[PDB]
Amino acid sequence: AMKELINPALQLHDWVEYYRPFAANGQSANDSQLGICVLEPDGTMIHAGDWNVSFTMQSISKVISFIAACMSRGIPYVLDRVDVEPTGDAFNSIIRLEINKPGKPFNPMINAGALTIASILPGESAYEKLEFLYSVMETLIGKRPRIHEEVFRSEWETAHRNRALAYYLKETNFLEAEVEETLEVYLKQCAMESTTEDIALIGLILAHDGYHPIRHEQVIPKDVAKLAKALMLTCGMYNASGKYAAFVGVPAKSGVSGGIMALVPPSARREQPFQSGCGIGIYGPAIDEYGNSLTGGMLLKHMAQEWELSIF
Amino acid sequence: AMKELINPALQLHDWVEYYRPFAANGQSANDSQLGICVLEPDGTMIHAGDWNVSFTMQSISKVISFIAACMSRGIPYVLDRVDVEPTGDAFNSIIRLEINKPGKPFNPMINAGALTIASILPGESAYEKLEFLYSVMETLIGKRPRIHEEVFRSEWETAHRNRALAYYLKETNFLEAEVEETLEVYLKQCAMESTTEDIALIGLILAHDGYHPIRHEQVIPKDVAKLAKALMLTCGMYNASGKYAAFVGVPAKSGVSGGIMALVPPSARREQPFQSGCGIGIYGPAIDEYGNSLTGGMLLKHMAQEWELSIF
């Protein structure tokens, strides 16, 4: 049940049960859900809690779109539109777009940068851009992603903050597409559905520098896979990234819907557990002030401390 | 002899001569000096260029004071005075000390955080605090540190911006000592001398989680050493840390005098060279807009990419 192909299992069971209650300290912006899936290169998979419950990727999708953009346009082209620096600000902060002239978004993990990324995906319309993104997604999890239309429609009507960012980006020429078209792509990718298993698989692929261990094929260029991991570590948890690097030490990416995708490169897992590295998928709807899963973050920290996963 | 004890050598020789000329694009504020030293666990060291030229550590000293503060006060006490988050701002920026209430310094690598760290070192006077710092320094490099008096006198006369930071920190109660006392400690630690060999040895110790490979003893608590490495990666190069993580990938710390201390933990090296890890010491007086050695950074990047040092 808890272990299959596609101590640790028991520990995860116990940890999920222990941390679940802390959800009362966070918000969803069912809060008590907590699930996790850990995947190894040989297909070995362990999970606990609400690991098979579907949720929208939200910001986790930013890692995929950034990778897709890099694969299509090449890293140099992407770098001319977005930098790779932490802002020290909230994920949806607009400040630097005006203060840091010319106004290039600081990184592709914050909303501003992710909007620029969405606008540079190949395609003449939102439909083509998304089809390209879905094709990349398909090579990763082996299936065309399903869009949670109810959530998309919900976010589409209340995305005032994101529209502000997009229009400011348009103003300063850091959008390679029309605003509404960009918003559509951005909100649609955020609405792609996933369970902890899917993001654990994407995590595993990145851990192995773009090589898909189950299909035995290089699906993401190594240099691009490496770049994604670096951005996850420095900006993946926004203005909480520093704390995560210091007290967890594993590249991770959150989504305000409560998901967290993390990964551990080979050997950086402690000789005993997951020596060959692993992909990690976590789900905990209750999020903190930074937008990161509260119970999911605590669970990850515990795993990293206990199994010595830190890459530092 | 480019290799001794306390292709790689030939490559470093070649790269130093190649990158040396780029100093014209930066400034010191000798400008063309470029040196490097790489130290391995077995005591084997390789060097090229101006590797044996004495220079002031400047900000590199911040890693040591941070470590000393953690060893003396314990991590919990330190974390109550300074955070571990990137600012997205210049190393000497004062902005967040006012904007982000109550005003805790974001991290110990930026000037503000380092000043707080200096104020919490054990002792009732600048001399007492420094004595302790020098004793820790001695256990690392095996000798009492020498202070560049001329440089200290110069810093002391023109440290207007740093005094501004110190007085603001005092204002918000994030300085556990008197301002002038703290400035003395800060400017003195910055004036401690070293060559690329000394900082490579410190980097080697950190790479091995606080274990001195040549003396065979734990000189820095493992958790403190790991914390320093995390801060180096996220904040060590200030608002260029994101770029370094993305295109170099090894924990690094700069000093405005042109030094760069970097490190590579075991296995996170390739298969060769330096499979067991190494400490890296670099010196390139010409610095960029971020306060980081221009040619030194280029040299570090070339090494990292060529030998695949990235920890991601």
From Swiss-Prot, chains A, B:
GO biological process entries: glutamate biosynthetic process; glutamine catabolic process
Pfam families assigned: Glutaminase (PF04960)
Listed GO MF terms: glutaminase activity
Superkingdom of source: Bacteria
Entries under SUPFAM superfamilies matching the protein: beta-lactamase/transpeptidase-like
Enzyme Commission code(s) on record: 3.5.1.2
Keywords, ordered alphabetically: Hydrolase
InterPro entries on file: Beta-lactam/transpept-like (IPR012338), Glutaminase (IPR015868)
Family stated for the protein in its record: Belongs to the glutaminase family.
Subunit structure: Homotetramer.
The name this protein goes by in its record: Glutaminase 1
Organism expressing this protein natively: Bacillus subtilis (strain 168)
